[PDB]
Design a protein around this nucleic acid. Structure first.
Ligand code: IRI
Ligand code: IRI
Ligand code: IRI
Ligand SMILES: [K+]
Length: 14
RNA sequence: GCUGCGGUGUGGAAGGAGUGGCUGGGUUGCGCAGC
């Protein structure tokens, strides 16, 4: 899971 | 690789899903969960 580790709205970027 | 829950806070009890996010923690951190 090399991608978004946290979702829902705008959580999890960088 | 994608997605969901203001669920977390060195403010988190007057808030939210960033319609404050070049105003910070934080290039949306942390936790939990699902495909
Ligand atoms: N969960 Ir309380 N954050 N710890 N609301 N009880 N203060
Ligand atoms: N400038 Ir800033 N926005 N505060 N360090 N990049 N995070
Ligand atoms: N501007 Ir900012 N919000 N502080 N993107 N660098 N993290
Ligand atoms: K805040």
């Amino acid at each position: 899971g090399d991608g978004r580790r946290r979702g829902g709205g705008g959580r999890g970027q960088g």
